[PDB]
Design a protein around this ligand. Structure first.
Ligand SMILES: Nc1nc2c(ncn2[C@@H]2O[C@H](COP(=O)(O)OP(=O)(O)NP(=O)(O)O)[C@@H](O)[C@H]2O)c(=O)[nH]1
Ligand SMILES: [Mg+2]
Length: 188
């Protein structure tokens, strides 16, 4: 059925589109109306990364609101990978990416989380407040890749999760990430 199970965490400011991204990926639908997340919700999906090779993704949908941050950060340890969103139409959400990144950098046990930077709501092209280039430069400065997604228009949603799963899978194949006693980030 699957080779590995990976735990992924999706993080970023409130309202950037984390829950909608995850629901488009797992439910294939766009939630036109979306309550702010309280604590951390759970979604799952199998992905076939290569023919006959499946990875189970256990996805933690985190609350962006500041008052739930104590809950969100409790999940960093047991995550192997994640997506860090900003909203391309919300420059303050981009300004906060460095803060989200600096905070994950002190959560490097058993490993640094494998992150991709996600410029979300890329359907709102005329409302853009962040250039692709400055987001690509920020991602590169933290050694991560960048992708622009839309939950509304189903743009790059499968690719965001699938590319990150392939990256983690290759790190596991090289032994750079391994199963660890009591860690839930990777399971055989
Ligand atoms: N145009 C557009 N709107 C989107 C997109 N994704 C989410 N939205 C909208 O953005 C708002 C917040 O989305 P939501 O996923 O709830 O955000 P969040 O990051 O989960 N918020 P929180 O951290 O508080 O739980 C909603 O109005 C939702 O419809 C997208 O790709 N495009
Ligand atoms: Mg949410």
């Amino acid at each position: 059925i699957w080779l590995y199970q990976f735990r992924l965490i999706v993080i970023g400011d409130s309202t950037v589109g984390k829950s909608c991204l995850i629901r488009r990926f797992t439910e294939g639908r766009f939630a036109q109306v979306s309550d702010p997340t309280v604590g951390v919700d759970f979604f799952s999906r199998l992905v076939e990364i290569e023919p006959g090779k499946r990875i189970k993704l256990q996805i933690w949908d985190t609350a962006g609101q500041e008052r739930f941050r104590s809950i969100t950060r409790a999940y960093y340890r047991n995550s192997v990978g994640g997506l860090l969103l900003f909203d391309i139409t919300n420059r303050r959400s981009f300004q906060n990416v460095h803060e989200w990144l600096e905070e994950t950098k002190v959560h490097v046990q058993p490993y640094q989380i494998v992150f991709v930077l996600v410029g979300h709501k890329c359907d709102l092209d005329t409302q853009r407040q962040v250039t692709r280039h400055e987001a690509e430069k920020l991602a590169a400065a933290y050694g991560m890749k960048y992708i622009e997604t839309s939950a509304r228009d189903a743009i790059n949603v499968e690719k965001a999760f699938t590319d990150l799963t392939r990256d983690i899978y290759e790190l596991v194949k090289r032994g750079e990430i391994t199963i660890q006693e009591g860690w839930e980030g990777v399971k055989s």
